[PDB]
């Protein structure tokens, strides 16, 4: 690997991520979005599940 | 899920004591683990 | 560059022996690669040219 080589030739990292969901709890998921809290009003909400 | 509760109270006695408490949860562990024995570490 | 070469001679040897269905064609590539690899090592830009070159022609008529 050289500063110089051309495109085919130079280094490229790679992650690969392998994403698994066997018999177990499964607690590796993004974020999950909220919203401001509104109160005296009628709402649809959702709190947690 | 591995659910561990527990309650800590003082006491002056052999034996369990009889009286009433409620224990709370206290860890929740998403392991996926099969038990079926156990051991008491000292 | 040299080494941008010798990269694609241990292509070639890679794909040259996949396809080397008989072992004339084994020996052929693996003496191949013993003189670019010596080539290499010794900074002989026109051993390391000349045995890709073939390598090169080996591993198309392997292929057609
Ligand atoms: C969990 O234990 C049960 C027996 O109570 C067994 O049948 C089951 O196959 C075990 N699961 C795993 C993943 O070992």
Same mark, same amino acid.
């Given at each position: ?49 | ?42 | ?9 241990? #292509?070639?040897? %890679? ?5 080397? +269905?008989? @072992? ?7 003496? $191949?690669? !013993?003189?670019? #690899?010596?080539? %290499? ?5 026109? +051993?390391? @040219? ?7 022609? $080996?591993? !198309?008529?392997?292929?057609?």
């Amino acid at each position: 690997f050289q500063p110089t080589n051309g495109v085919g030739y130079q280094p490229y990292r790679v992650v690969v991520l392998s994403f698994e969901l066997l018999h177990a709890p499964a607690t590796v998921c993004g974020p999950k979005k909220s919203t401001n809290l509104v109160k005296n009003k009628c709402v649809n909400f959702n709190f947690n599940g | 899920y591995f659910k561990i509760y527990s309650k800590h109270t003082p006491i002056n006695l052999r034996d369990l004591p009889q009286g009433f408490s409620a224990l709370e949860p206290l860890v929740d562990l998403p392991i996926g683990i099969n038990i079926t024995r156990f051991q008491t570490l000292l | 560059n040299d080494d941008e070469l010798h990269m694609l001679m241990t #292509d070639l040897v %890679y794909e040259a022996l996949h396809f080397a +269905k008989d @072992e004339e064609i084994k020996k052929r590539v693996f003496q $191949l690669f !013993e003189l670019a #690899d010596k080539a %290499y090592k010794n900074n002989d830009r026109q +051993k390391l @040219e000349k045995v890709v070159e073939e390598l090169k022609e $080996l591993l !198309e008529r392997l292929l057609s």
